[PDB]
Amino acid sequence: NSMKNIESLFDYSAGQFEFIDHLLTMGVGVHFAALIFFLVVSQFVAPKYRIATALSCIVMVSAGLILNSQAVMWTDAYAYVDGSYQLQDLTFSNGYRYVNWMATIPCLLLQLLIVLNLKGKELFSTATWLILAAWGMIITGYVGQLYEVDDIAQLMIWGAVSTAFFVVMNWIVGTKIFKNRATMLGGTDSTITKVFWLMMFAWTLYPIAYLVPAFMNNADGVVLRQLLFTIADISSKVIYGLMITYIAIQQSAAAGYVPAQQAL
Numbered sequence: 119n120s121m122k123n124i125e126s127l128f129d130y131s132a133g134q135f136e137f138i139d140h141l142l143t144m145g146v147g148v149h150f151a152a153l154i155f156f157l158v159v160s161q162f163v164a165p166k167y168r169i170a171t172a173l174s175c176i177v178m179v180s181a182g183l184i185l186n187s188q189a190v191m192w193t194d195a196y197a198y199v200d201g202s203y204q205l206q207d208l209t210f211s212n213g214y215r216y217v218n219w220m221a222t223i224p225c226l227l228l229q230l231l232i233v234l235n236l237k238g239k240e241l242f243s244t245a246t247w248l249i250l251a252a253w254g255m256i257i258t259g260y261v262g263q264l265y266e267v268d269d270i271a272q273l274m275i276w277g278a279v280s281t282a283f284f285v286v287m288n289w290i291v292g293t294k295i296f297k298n299r300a301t302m303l304g305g306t307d308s309t310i311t312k313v314f315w316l317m318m319f320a321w322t323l324y325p326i327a328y329l330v331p332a333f334m335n336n337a338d339g340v341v342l343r344q345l346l347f348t349i350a351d352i353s354s355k356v357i358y359g360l361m362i363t364y365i366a367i368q369q370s371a372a373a374g375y376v377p378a379q380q381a382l
């Protein structure tokens with residue numbers, strides 16, 4: 119699975135290799151630091167919204183474990199030899215991120231629907247269509263990147279199919295947001311609209327990283343891709359969760375939850 123990604127094609131300078139290692143290890147710290155924050159403020163969230171901050175804790179740990187796994191895989195697969203880090207064993211691939219996404223994306227979408235105050239039949243219904251659309255996106259994306267070394271054309275076609283799911287997914291999300299933001303309390307009807315645009319921006323970096331093999335097929339393309347993943351993860355998981363948490367607390371406060379009012 120590692121021979122199919124471009125990381126296996128190149129030697130890396132100390133500077134490139136340590137920059138990638140430092141990017142992944144920093145990602146671990148950030149996520150686990152935000153995990154403590156999400157855990158602490160959960161007591162300031164009304165029971166109605168408390169599951170949202172819990173889902174952020176699930177995302178933080180899910181991401182932190184795969185980023186930590188990826189950093190160690192990175193240092194195991196390569197060895198500094200003759201002035202460059204060269205592939206030693208085949209134990210590093212990007213496929214594990216696509217596993218992180220399969221798991222984190224349903225959680226990220228669920229926390230959004232919860233603060234939108236959807237409930238019951240509509241919650242279960244809307245969540246099912248989003249998670250299926252999203253899994254189709256991720257799965258077709260994972261098939262495509264198996265060809266980023268061998269068959270770029272296939273990468274593209276699987277990229278096109280994956281993007282179809284992405285567009286439909288965002289159309290559902292946007293439609294539910296704009297049709298339900300009047301139900302939101304404390305002025306969060308204004309904040310949720312920004313969350314949506316944060317989503318659009320953060321999530322669009324992933325397909326850009328996905329296409330790096332096609333327009334920068336070299337060792338700096340590998341560094342660049344990890345940098346895009348790092349900006350994307352922090353924005354779609356950390357900042358977004360903070361955005362979701364702030365909305366949860368605000369609506370809790372507007373709903374008469376005392377611990378939420380005292381915290382604010």
Ligand SMILES: CCCCCCCC/C=C\CCCCCCCC(=O)OC[C@H](O)CO
Nearest residue numbers: 278281282285288289290291292293296297
């Ligand atoms: C590569 C081939 C396939 C590529 C095709 C690309 C087409 C993209 C079209 C629109 C943007 C999609 C994003 C949709 C953003 C959410 C839509 C929305 O804002 O919802 C509207 C709602 O009806 C208001 O109440």
Ligand SMILES: *C\C=C(C)/C=C/C=C(C)/C=C/C1=C(C)CCCC1(C)C
Nearest residue numbers: 256259280281284321324325328354
């Ligand atoms: C970690 C959180 C999230 C929301 C991950 C999001 C991933 C995507 C939006 C991926 C999209 C893809 C597209 C649209 C087509 C290329 C293949 C991808 C799966 C990378």
Ligand SMILES: CCCCCCCC/C=C\CCCCCCCC(=O)O
Nearest residue numbers: 165166167169241242245246249250
């Ligand atoms: C394809 C996988 C299955 C798809 C179904 C996804 C699961 C969604 C099911 C239930 C919605 C979760 C809501 C949890 C309760 C929170 C409600 C609340 O406290 O206000």
Ligand SMILES: CCCCCCCC/C=C\CCCCCCCC(=O)O
Nearest residue numbers: 220250251252253254255257258261
């Ligand atoms: C067990 C977790 C995975 C859940 C799968 C169910 C979700 C369905 C999502 C979209 C189906 C797309 C399947 C197309 C795969 C073709 C790739 C191939 O066969 O080589």
Ligand SMILES: CCCCCCCC/C=C\CCCCCCCC(=O)O
Nearest residue numbers: 269270271274275277278281325329
């Ligand atoms: C992930 C973004 C989704 C959109 C993908 C772009 C759609 C295809 C665009 C142009 C087709 C160009 C096909 C060139 C194939 C030859 C390249 C090669 O095989 O080496």
